[PDB]
Swiss-Prot record, chain A:
The organism's taxonomic lineage, starting at the top: Bacteria, Pseudomonadati, Pseudomonadota, Gammaproteobacteria, Alteromonadales
UniProt GO cellular component terms: cytoplasm
SUPFAM superfamilies in the record: TorD-like
Broad class of the protein's primary localization: cytoplasm
Described purpose of this protein according to its UniProt entry: Involved in the biogenesis of TorA. Acts on TorA before the insertion of the molybdenum cofactor and, as a result, probably favors a conformation of the apoenzyme that is competent for acquiring the cofactor.
Protein name (record): Chaperone protein TorD
Biological source species: Shewanella massilia
Family as reported in the entry's similarity comment: Belongs to the TorD/DmsD family. TorD subfamily.
Amino acid sequence: DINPARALVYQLLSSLFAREVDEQRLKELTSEAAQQFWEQLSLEANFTQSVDKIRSTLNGIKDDEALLELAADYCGLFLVGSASPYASLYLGEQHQQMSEFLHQSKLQVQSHFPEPADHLAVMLAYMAHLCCHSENSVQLSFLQTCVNSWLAKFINHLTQCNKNGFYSAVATLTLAWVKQDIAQLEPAVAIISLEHHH
Amino acid sequence: VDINPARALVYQLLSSLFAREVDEQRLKELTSEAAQQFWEQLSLEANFTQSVDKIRSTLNGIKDDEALLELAADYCGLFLVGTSASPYASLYLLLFGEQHQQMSEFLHQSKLQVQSHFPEPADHLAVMLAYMAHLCCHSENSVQLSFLQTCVNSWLAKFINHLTQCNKNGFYSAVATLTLAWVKQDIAQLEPAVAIISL
């Protein structure tokens, strides 16, 4: 009864922390239907001051420089770490419930953080999965596209940071292992193209 | 004979070495008598010899916690810092971006954990508020109340305090301030509503 309205307020607040505000969003936040909304929210004594600051700011963005500055505030405050909006930086089972929610919603926040699946550990773990669950062509393609395309660089920079050399050796072995695996996969994959063509 | 499962095991081993710092239990399983056989055999491949011997000589050389802590320090000061060799592909670089769609699914299913200093994505306030929005219409009042008191109201004021200190113009502080006041008023409505169902 009142819940859909509450969901709506939480969504709006969420959107404001999710990512910086672009032209399309600004137009959505300052339209007539949005103006009435902000007014209604302002009627509550505990919300009045905050609602006026938010609404007067958004209504004051008339050019590109105005929108760009607000975004700079967003980036300067949340994408540097500053006041990163992560609970753990200021302070259990309902994190898993959210984990699923995250996976389901396809809702991702603006972030300067590297993509988790871009972690070498993840790529290798996934390749291990491809070895027994995919065609050789998919395995080869993945090694050439996502692994062999950058290890050399990683290794190079690793040799300038690892004094001991343990992890430099691990990286070195990984590339060597990948190259040899690619050489075993090439003919296999090529046989299938010579056969699926004739 | 099928070698695909053997290849997967090797990729997993390499995966583990970048996945997290080596701990006591892991050092033991990486240096067991069965493991020594594996390394020796792997070292016989001409292309692998040098790095393998560096790998195992290092692992076999670990005989006290000091040396172990030293390796763990190498790991952290190399991958977990951020300036000097993060293991992320994007940081060193066509059908690339499209293969990331399947990895996310595998990453969600494998529930594989990579040691990291980055905060959890679900810990982000925007994701918590979106989740709360969801609970508002697909959950009992008590689950909503519980989540607010437990995950939001517990740290929001600390956040607003710091935010207010870094926000010169003050727009985002106003958003954060309105958020807390919204959450508090909502908890105020939720408590009476929930308590009543015990009657």
